[PDB]
Every structure is written in structure tokens, then in C-alpha cells.
């Protein structure tokens with residue numbers, strides 16, 4: 106009753122869904138009781154997985170994604186993760202990273218996810234625009250969520266969310282959706298003059 | 301379009317009166333299940349919830365709710381209208397996945413929550429209906 110291993114979480118998933126986890130396209134390991142604390146090499150058996158659900162656990166470090174040859178959506182929201190790292194093994198295929206409600210303050214390492222289209226990271230610990238500049242390397246990034254980070258809250262509490270959206274699009278000119286709302290043509294134009 | 305889910309969401313909010321929120325504030329300690337109900341509202345609104353963490357409630361392990369953040373939400377006089385105004389079309393897939401652990405608990409039902417706290421238990425139906433709306437609308 107301290108921590109659930111990946112192996113044990115897979116058995117719970119297979120009992121709830123009646124699919125062999127090695128065959129499954131969506132592997133649901135979220136919300137284990139007790140929480141998962143460590144990713145491990147059992148994840149390498151999940152060769153068919155396109156959507157790995159590991160949200161609502163107590164994972165502290167990203168690791169052990171080697172062997173997930175089809176992984177397209179990596180869901181790690183509501184864990185204890187501080188650093189974006191150890192993602193080279195899925196960089197060729199990963200299109201969405203869902204990692205809201207973690208403890209990420211630096212986006213160093215996000216640049217490896219060259220095919221990323223969607224990044225959800227509400228309620229993390231981003232405090233400065235220098236972190237958002239690191240996202241400009243992602244040529245396919247279309248959908249971004251920053252609500253609840255200190256940097257977002259700074260602007261929200263001063264009734265300046267419009268200024269915050271311009272700061273984002275200034276750095277990410279091709280972004281299509283921000284915090285669930287489309288980037289409109291007037292926001293792009295203001296961002297173009299600000300840039 | 302998912303009008304049965306949206307109809308249930310609106311019935312849920314219309315079942316809650318301002319006096320219900322007042323009386324809930326008057327409790328020194330809320331029933332544990334109501335803190336999880338409000339966590340579902342916090343998740344949909346992208347407000348703070350605490351780490352995954354469990355406590356024994358009537359013989360089952362259930363998530364510890366972030367009730368102080370729920371109180372902050374309830375201390376805004378616009379709270380109920382804010383839920384009526386909620387932009388359902390902006391729910392994303394991650395938010396639905398973060399709700400599912402609450403719905404996984406055998407005791408997380410309107411009947412059980414209503415027995416504990418009355419009309420405010422409608423927020424359980426509101427949260428489940430928003431998730432149902434999102435899953436249908438795509």
C-alpha cells in the first residue's frame with residue numbers, strides 16, 4: 106500500500122478492460138491506488154500503445170519509454186515531475202504531451218519532441234517568458250495550455266490576459282490554439298507588430 | 301452536439317441554491333465526498349488540486365480533496381453563474397482523463413453524495429455531464 110509497480114498497474118488495467126496490454130492501443134495506468142511512483146522497463150512491452158495514460162500518480166521522473174514504438178500521446182498529468190527529459194526514445198512518434206499539474210519550472214529538453222503538436226501543461230511552475238522561447242523550436246506545435254502557471258496567473262490577476270496571449274504568439278507565431286481558445290487573426294497581427 | 305448531456309448539466313446547476321452554498325460554508329468540516337465533488341469542478345476549471353493521495357473513507361481508499369481551493373471558489377459571489385457560463389467547447393482530452401479517477405471510486409455517486417450534503421451534490425452530475433458532453437461531441 107505504498108506504491109504500485111508498472112507490472113501491477115498493467116494487471117489492474119487488463120482486469121478492467123479485458124485486453125492484453127501488449128496489444129492495446131490505449132494503456133490506462135492512471136489513478137492507481139496506491140500511486141505509481143516509478144516508470145520502469147515493463148513499459149517496453151507496450152509495443153502497440155499509441156496513448157499511454159499515466160496521469161494521477163506520484164511519478165517523480167520520466168524514464169523507461171524505450172520500446173514504445175507507436176507512442177503518440179504521452180499523458181503524465183497530476184504527477185510529481187520536475188524535468189522534461191528521457192524522451193528521445195519516443196521523439197520520432199510523439200505528437201501530444203499531456204503533463205498538467207506537475208512541478209515543471211524549466212522547459213529545457215522539450216526541444217527534442219520535434220513532432221509535438223499538442224502540449225498541455227496547466228498548473229505547472231513556469232514563471233518566465235524565457236521558458237516559452239524554448240517552445241519556438243517546435244515547428245509543428247499547434248495547441249498549447251499554460252493556464253495556472255505563475256506566469257499565466259501574473260497576467261490573469263492584473264486583468265491582462267490579452268497581453269499574455271500576445272506575448273505567447275510573439276514567440277510562437279504559428280500557434281493555432283492557446284488555453285483552449287483559437288489564436289485569432291487580430292492577435293497574430295498584434296504579435297507581429299510586437300515582434 | 302450532445303443535448304442530453306448538456307440538459308443534465310443544466311438541471312444539476314439549477315438544483316443548487318445560493319443558500320446551499322451559504323450553508324455549506326457554515327459547516328466546520330464537510331463530508332469527505334463533497335471535497336472530491338468540488339475537486340472535479342476544480343479540474344474542469346483548471347484550478348489547483350493537490351497531488352494524488354488517498355485516505356480511508358468508510359473502508360475504501362479515496363482521493364483527498366483540495367477543499368481550501370473549493371472554499372476560495374465558493375467565496376466568489378459569482379460562483380454558480382460562473383459554472384453556468386462554463387465554456388464546454390474548450391474542455392480538452394487531458395481534463396477528461398484527470399476526472400476519471402474520481403468516477404472510478406465505487407462510492408462516487410449522486411445518491412451517496414446527496415445523502416451526505418444535499419443539493420450541492422448536483423455538482424457530481426454537472427462534472428460527469430461535462431465529461432460526457434466532451435466525449436460525445438468529438
Ligand code: NA
Nearest residue numbers: 320321323324
Ligand atoms: Na449545503
